[model samples]
Target: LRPKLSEEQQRIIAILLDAHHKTYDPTYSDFCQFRPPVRVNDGGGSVTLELSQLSMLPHLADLVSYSIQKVIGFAKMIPGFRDLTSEDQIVLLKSSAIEVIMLRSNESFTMDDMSWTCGNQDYKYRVSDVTKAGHSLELIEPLIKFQVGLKKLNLHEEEHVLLMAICIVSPDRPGVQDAALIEAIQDRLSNTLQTYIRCRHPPPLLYAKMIQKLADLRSLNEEHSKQYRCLSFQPECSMKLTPLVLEVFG
Candidate 1:
């Protein structure tokens, strides 16, 4: 909606960044730091989160923020972007910022990040300002299944769980995470028969914040270079199964 930052907007962006730096943490590690084109995956590709190294730190909230940017940056660099004509780029940018990252030069790319955008150029919208939208998971689940079908992505149990969690915890918009949302998710999960719903409320954001406080953490995870040989999405799988179980109680 806001035309890709005009020259004037770019200038204002710098000013805003500087102003934000004055009030917020200016450290390169700060979650709010205005880092340049950042890298997420290794040469082979995959987000590397160094939890051990992060644990050594005094803080974690900022690191969480950084982790988010790392994903965003990775999505931005998705391989074949430059090959498209500028017009196509604009079209893609305007149409679906999320899919823009999926476009590839040759090999197919699987992005780990998810996003939601709505509306057009003039009044085009994001979830933040949309009113009258219900925040119930019942409505969201079908959409997730529909999207997975359209993408033809293999529906791994874990990925499905993660999608369900996203629908439960996020603001129906990309990049927004909150404890209240997670609590709502906990309630939703409780209504089901899922094993993960044993906790009255997951409070993921609050838990992350508490961990950050104990460790004196303040920066975003700018350079997540640590790696795991394989990704066992077991945690995600468990979380998703909770909703199915919850239905029995309702």
Candidate 2:
């Protein structure tokens, strides 16, 4: 028998749920953009899509960049998130954006063959494809391992959103000035998560396990940033990435 969430916890859950569903469409790409026969007529609003070749590396980078934009959009709607000092806001976002992307990517990550399924079925990505993107096995291997572990938990939607929100509003992110302000929002989300698990999920382990995933995300983020810096330094590699990817990661 579990106690029901208080009004405040319920309210936060609703906001998180609504914001997530509204913002994360995940139904979209690059790399396949340029081709001949620019426009053809169908008279009945028909569309023709012929075979197109895509550069996997830049395409994947664009996906990450696009997802980053959506994550920042989602973060803005969190209660009290906007109230943080400007510097704190950037600090928290800059530090945690990739972690949030990793969390979000779980939805598209396929476990059986270790591939990512985009909106279009024709463009599935595997570790081999990622290697073609210049990513070493070191980062991709641990990343796949992390995704496998996290997805095994089978987190409910509410818990997933709360975790993403909690990830963004962390008090411990480096250079955060309004730690107290950040902590306040985090505490509310944390409380929501705890009460939520008690009300709907299994008794105890889920909470601890999810927290552990966030801890792992920190390590993954550090490795990803290091690898990205390495990738961008190569003259040929930098041009392959979009401006947003370079700017955000640069």
Candidate 3:
């Protein structure tokens, strides 16, 4: 039998669940439907896409900005997240924003073929190379692996949100002025997650497996940061990262 959650705990979990649903809309947005039109080329078997002829840098930047903002908005919904010092908040976000974005993106991931199903299109890693350079192959490989593992576990909506909350409040992240406070909060969240997973999954190994996935997420975040820095140096890429994005990944 499982112990009952306190009123406050239940409320907090409800907030996270609501935020997760709101932050990640599975419905395809305008940007998801955006693939430049393709046309016949000089060669009989070849074709050309408008993507090669024009830059969508500004639109890409806006899409990234919206993604980052949604994650930050989710953070605000966490009960005590905003109570942390401004520097601590920034530090936490810098350390974990990419992981949060990556996890949220899994909502639309197709594990069987290793592609992102954006609208009616399936975006493979090679297609991502247009903006991400050759980095997508390395970065996305681990991302898809992790996503597939997590999906196999069939985490509850609340569990997914709790994991994201735990990612943001990492006590080890540098520049946190309130390490004790953050650590305490992280401990509570971890305990809550463990309890939920234990009750729902019964298997003794599942918790350990999910904990290992957190480390995997950290590794993926490093690769994501590397790609962000690479994009910053690409003169032909006109994508403009917002200040918050630069602070987090640049």
Which candidate number maximizes lDDT? 2
> lDDT at 121 for candidate 2?
48
In terms of TM-score, the best-performing candidate is: 2
Query: Each candidate's lDDT (Cα)?
Result: 0.26, 0.77, 0.67
User: Of the candidates numbered 1 and 3, which has the greater lDDT value?
Assistant: 3
Q: Write the per-residue lDDT of candidate 3 for residues 157-202, one digit (tens) a residue.
A: 7877898898888888778889999988888788777777656655
Task: Give the per-residue lDDT of model 2 (tens digit) for 124-241.
Answer: 7676556555566678889999999988989999999999999999999878887888999999898889888988886347889999999999999989888888776665666567
Q: Write the per-residue lDDT of candidate 1 for residues 126-193, one digit (tens) a residue.
A: 11111111112332343333333334433232222222222222222223334344345433322331
Residue-level lDDT for 80 in candidate 2: 79
Give the total clashing residue pairs for model 3: 0
* Model 2 regions lying over 4 Å from their true place: 29-55, 202-204
What CA RMSD would you report for each candidate? 23.1, 8.1, 4.6
Weakest 10 consecutive residues of candidate 2 by summed lDDT: 45-54
Candidate number that wins on TM-score, 1 or 3 = 3
Q: Which ten residues in a row have the lowest lDDT in candidate 1?
A: 220-229
The TM-score-based order of candidates, best leading, equals 2, 3, 1
Model 3 TM-score?
Answer: 0.80
The segments of candidate 3 whose C-alpha lies over 4 angstroms from its true place after superposition are: 30-61, 122-136, 202-204, 236-244
The model with the greater lDDT, 1 or 2, is 2
